[PDB]
Amino acid sequence: HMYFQKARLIHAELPLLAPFKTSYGELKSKDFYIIELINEEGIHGYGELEAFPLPDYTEETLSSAILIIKEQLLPLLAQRKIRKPEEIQELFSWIQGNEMAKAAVELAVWDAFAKMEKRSLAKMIGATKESIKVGVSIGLQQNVETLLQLVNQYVDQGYERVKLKIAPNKDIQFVEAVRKSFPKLSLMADANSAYNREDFLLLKELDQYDLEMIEQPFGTKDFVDHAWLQKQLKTRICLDENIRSVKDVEQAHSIGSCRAINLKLARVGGMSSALKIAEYCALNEILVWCGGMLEAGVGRAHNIALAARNEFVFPGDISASNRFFAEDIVTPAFELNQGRLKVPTNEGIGVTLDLKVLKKYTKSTEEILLN
Amino acid sequence: HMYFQKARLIHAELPLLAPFKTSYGELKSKDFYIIELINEEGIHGYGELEAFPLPDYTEETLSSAILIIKEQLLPLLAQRKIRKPEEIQELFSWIQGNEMAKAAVELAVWDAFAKMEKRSLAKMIGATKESIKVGVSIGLQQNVETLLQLVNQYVDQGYERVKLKIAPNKDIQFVEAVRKSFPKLSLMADANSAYNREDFLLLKELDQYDLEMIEQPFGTKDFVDHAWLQKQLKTRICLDENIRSVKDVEQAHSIGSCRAINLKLARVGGMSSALKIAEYCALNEILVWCGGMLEAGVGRAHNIALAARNEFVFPGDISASNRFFAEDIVTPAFELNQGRLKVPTNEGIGVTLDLKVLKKYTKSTEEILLN
Ligand SMILES: [Mg+2]
Ligand SMILES: [Mg+2]
């Protein structure tokens, strides 16, 4: 039982060690928001808005999402008494789409409760693991030779799973190379909606490489063509973009669009929603794993608590800050210990903000009286 | 061949005669934007942003959409030379969702071209009609008696089609009443996503009332449950919310989710997109008609040109301004002549702005240089 006294929206931007390539862009940093929800008893809950700057991933964007947060989500909490962190998905239920905005606010509310109950956010959602095996993603390489070198570094580093980025001209030849060299390494392929039905031959040729899964070969809204392809392959197909809720998984399932789901907290609307989906995939043999969105310290802390659940077996897209950022905004840095990350045990998300580090990356601060 | 010199974003709000009820709200007016695109040869193209204030219809909202227009759509036109109005859907293609933002800008570009070619926008997209039969929508009534009275007024007024709003407790008993009283009046039912699979009995009981169609009984993102229902009915099922493109219709089709499509320019991203869909429904026996979004003068003018196409047979949701607004922002008011509206013949959308009437409803004006 708690009431949210005020909200503090912090806009920050972290320098990426290396540029991140998106569909129709290239990130040079992680532009995000920190939603700080403050209890009426002095507890601070933290969430992170993950929306990319361009609507080249999903329809949402940072500027538009934070706008929906201010004009749509925060006003709802203003009055309200919240009893379960899960009541949040409900009052936001009438809102269509805008999942990443909801997530930023809702995940803050969860952290606030786990804090109140002196538990890890991981402990609270029921997780038991104390560490989780994270994976690694490699983009497109011009050389097969150089891909194999990159693949070698990580394996030696402890990463027990590798996601290879695929594309019509650079697909089958690279998968072999890696498969016929790491015959026991779990390996998946991400096709970033680069194929058409006409390329089913190319896609069928990958079935025989024991690929863990092939992510979104066709349209970002497609169910039909995916199903038409899934029925012709042994490898699981994985959806991403069009998976926003359990309801969305249910459709993909009955249609037979996929056998695996790339679950990302932000894209799915929060924690309540993510768990419902995890539980459902578990009951229907659908492989579920935590994808990523270049999260800063706060985003990553939540992601790891979700990843700690038993349903998640496949290594997710989480990693030590040091892989992307020169610096992060969370005090207990995430140490990579041979393909594994330590699940926070401290109250809430388990990590604190370097109000120091933050200050030098903060572009604006806004406080909102939810009362 | 034209280049857009500048853009003028006019924010206006018209007083509604009577309150308009939305899913989780009630409009008291039409808050919208007018996108005025100005040629390099002095031609003015006009579009209208239709997004509702709350994300209770689709994910978009006026405030967030106009934000996407400024930050995402207008910058693309800045440099560009446009040869066909249809080039607009293309450069916006990489953008996910955000259809109502696209529409406001793209429809402006069409009007600008039809103007350049001294043709009606209706003439240009190929329409031939000179008038179109519009319908009328009635919300939920407490009395069956009073619904029948309302139904009587319109029929005598000339409306050749009536859309009845349906809901679990107020459905079958009203349909009869109207059907067993106007045995020859085309009649459809709009279920505004108020039913579950468990209510298929209720929905099957309507099949026998020669209902033209039943709009979105189930989820606003659902294809599956709709298909499961369509296969059990004679009446056509009509989708709305989840129909954003030809591609979306293609899925609904192969899945068998519907037999009719409620086509609204804004929700579908513009004219290029709307025509593609109309043509497709025509080739695949799918009933297509123009739905509405409480358009002001500009929105309505475009809608009527689309409605003039041959594919649209069923009366759309268009009407004389006088049905909703005390005043409108378009000089040649739309006269209702026994269920029909006269298709503009004047250049472009065929109507002019009462810069006078506008001024007293304008809340802000913003000019943006595209050179
Ligand atoms: Mg993806
Ligand atoms: Mg509807």
From Swiss-Prot, chains A, B:
Keywords: Isomerase, Lyase, Magnesium, Menaquinone biosynthesis, Metal-binding
Domain of life: Bacteria
Active site: K165, K264
CDD domains: NAAAR
EC number(s) from the headed UniProt entry: 4.2.1.113, 5.1.1.-
A biological process term (GO) from this entry: menaquinone biosynthetic process
Residues at which Mg(2+) binds: D190, E215, D240
Catalytic activity, as annotated: (1R,6R)-6-hydroxy-2-succinyl-cyclohexa-2,4-diene-1-carboxylate = 2-succinylbenzoate + H2O
Pfam families noted in UniProt: MR_MLE_C (PF13378), MR_MLE_N (PF02746)
Known cofactor(s): a divalent metal cation
Entry's Gene Ontology molecular function annotations: isomerase activity; magnesium ion binding; O-succinylbenzoate synthase activity
Pathway the protein acts in: Quinol/quinone metabolism; 1,4-dihydroxy-2-naphthoate biosynthesis; 1,4-dihydroxy-2-naphthoate from chorismate: step 4/7; Quinol/quinone metabolism; menaquinone biosynthesis
Biological function: Converts 2-succinyl-6-hydroxy-2,4-cyclohexadiene-1-carboxylate (SHCHC) to 2-succinylbenzoate (OSB). Also acts as a N-succinylamino acid racemase (NSAR) that catalyzes the racemization of N-succinyl-L-phenylglycine. L.innocua has the menaquinone synthesis pathway, indicating that the species requires OSBS activity. However, the NSAR/OSBS is not encoded in the menaquinone operon, raising the possibility that both NSAR and OSBS are biological functions.
Quaternary state and interactors: Homodimer.
Family assignment from sequence similarity: Belongs to the mandelate racemase/muconate lactonizing enzyme family. MenC type 2 subfamily.
Cited PANTHER family: O-SUCCINYLBENZOATE SYNTHASE, O-SUCCINYLBENZOATE SYNTHASE-RELATED
Protein name: o-succinylbenzoate synthase
Organism in which the protein naturally occurs: Listeria innocua serovar 6a (strain ATCC BAA-680 / CLIP 11262)
Lineage, top ranks: Bacteria, Bacillati, Bacillota, Bacilli, Bacillales
